[PDB]
């Protein structure tokens, strides 16, 4: 019924590690598109939107649409038993009581198999309206993670101000104030430290640093992160997965 | 503060 | 008089780190062959059997049979004060209340000296019979440790099944079930990841993963581990020391 | 005003990490010679004496004498936001309510800028006299750190005995007794393991191992540490910063503990 | 359960 | 509170 095989298991390992601390139990909706996920945290403050397109699996085969209700802590415990370079095979029958994961060793003739009992999750699906953002910032994911951790040590809220010149992350706390200003940057041989600002109108919004630090647990998935800002819409933090995406939506502090 | 103030259900 | 000198102190450090979390207070029985240890855990489910042969000590001199009753936490605190590549000298009188430990640095002309007070431990000696095991598995110690920790995250018990094809470690829990199957594996390039299975009779037994994870704290002692199984005897997990051995015996569930 | 820039922030981060766990709130006294610090711990058993010479900053500019009262935990949180390979600029106004720190990336145009609110701290400065010590020991700082940690696992107090043979650190505890004896080790091929013992009179004093372990948080500042001892004077544990120094003074233990 | 059912005291 | 004997202020003048 459902088979999705990852050529290197690392991807799923990182994907689950980028999600678990934000949302506990989730539905993996599998269809002809691949595997999608939409989940709000228990706050109802942020929203995870993940798409793993059929392109990414060795054979991807989904005979019928299926929702796999999985506890992400259990899935993390099962995925920790796989090596980054193992061959991962996910399978599920029609009307499944469990999801089957198989990890195949590259070198040795070693085979691991796990069966995770599925969950019944009522999730209330939300409609994402395909938004045009006033400001779009492309930056190194590790630099954004460092900024978020640094400012989170001082405060609970960060102001992101996007202009044509660059982006300014600022905060205020008991210690005092802090700011990191990044500028529009191009490099030829080393493009891992590039910063792009596509802007039609300056934006300035305030966000929870705890949620941004949780979002930055996706840093291992890509060397670039995209921040999308506009008034009256939530912030979009997007990590490209290669034939898919992992997106976090965060409502501003009002 | 609620994210569902920006995203309509279903 | 007893003097036993180890060329690299790391060995004793790792042995005590491999024993302390399973058994706290232990007797080191010292005789002409070397330093032996036999101890059960407090719930009496597992048994530690260690032999440090005189061959491994540069001068070994044990004039009389003697029992050094040591608290392994105190010994660990003292042994942490030695470097991995230090020279260790253990000394004791014939009627001792304490043991003398000396750490000599190879390069710098540094000498550390400690006197550890001994304790009185009532000796539980058990007779371990000359067993012919139905299954004998030689595998990478790090792989066995990884399997044990992985499955211990999922369950409390592991079924070890040794058959003609290979060895299967299986477990069941509230989350679900899991299994890791290893096969006969010889390689000519990287031989540290070799797996040998000598089988005369298929075996299937159930064990506590907590105790196996505690056993795997001896991983630092050897790159290979040997598992010895039979339907009616306890599991043997053995780590070679070169000049001796460290063995864990686990009663099945 | 005050402006002083370090080409590599590492030093200040390291310096602050060697002091914060011993003393939290302190005044940084800035003048034409540079940035100095003298602070006692809350129990008044140890004393930190730091000098960061103007030599170490490429532009150093201090127009008037200024005392920056800083909470070292806050400063540590701010300094954690600097990379080891950043350009650090410390700044202060004439009548400052805060101190300004700037971290500039070497590669890229990235600028991090922080303002730490200052504190009102009355510092009780002591006159530390130019002493000629009976014993002076130069040894690897990491070796001294291991000695202190090892003996702290067994006891609360260490007896330091400096004689012509060498220097011996001994302790006694519930587990038993222990001692580490070092002798000078006149040179090697790899000279990071040298031990120097300059002695004019034997010394024997008892010290708190907790305070010495806290002192050894300066191990990251230099590969060697200097111990200075004399009967009836405090122990001096010194780490060189090059164009500056960090010194710890510890009063000997006098009790029945 | 109880290692001592296999090894005589 | 009195100063205790282990106190660097017993060793260094004001």
Numbering used by the authors:
A (entry chain C): 1 to 254
B (entry chain F): 299 to 308
C (entry chain A): 1 to 253
D (entry chain B): 1 to 257
E (entry chain D): -1 to 7
F (entry chain E): 294 to 307
How did the manuscript describe this experimental structure?
The DNA replication process is a desirable target for an antifungal product; hence, A. fumigatus proliferating cell nuclear antigen (afumPCNA) has been hypothesised as a fungal target for the development of new antifungals. The PCNA processivity factor is also known as the sliding clamp, as DNA slides through its central cavity. PCNA functions as a docking platform to allow DNA polymerases and a host of DNA replication and repair machinery to interact at the replication fork. The PCNA homotrimer comprises two domains, with each containing two alpha helices and nine beta strands, connected by a motif known as the interdomain connecting loop (IDCL), which forms part of the PCNA surface with which binding domain proteins interact.
The co-crystal structure of afumPCNA bound with the p21µ-afumRFC peptide was solved at a resolution of 2.30 Å in order to examine the structural features of an Afum-derived PIP-box. The KRRMP amino acids of the p21µ-afumRFC peptide fold over the PIP-box, not interacting with the afumPCNA’s surface. This is caused by a change in the sequence of the PIP-box compared to the human RFC sequence; the inclusion of a proline residue causes a kink, and the backbone carbonyl of ProXXX interacts with the Asp147 backbone amide and Asn150 residue side chain to stabilize the turn in the peptide. The second arginine, Arg143, is located close to the third arginine, Arg149, producing a loop structure (143–149). The Met144 side chain does not interact with the afumPCNA surface pocket as Gln144 in the p21µ PIP-box does with hPCNA. The Met144 backbone amide does interact with the Asn150 side chain and in turn also interacts with the Asp147 side chain, supporting the 310 helix via extra contacts that hold the compact structure. The p21µ-afumRFC PIP-box has an affinity for afumPCNA of less than 100 nM. This may be accounted for solely by the IIe147, Phe150, and Tyr151 residues, as previous research has shown these conserved residues to be highly favourable, especially IIe147. The two Arg residues can be replaced to create a linkage that, based on the X-ray crystallography structure, would not interrupt the 310-helical conformation and side chain exposure required for binding to afumPCNA, as these are 3.5 Å distance apart in the naturally forming architecture.
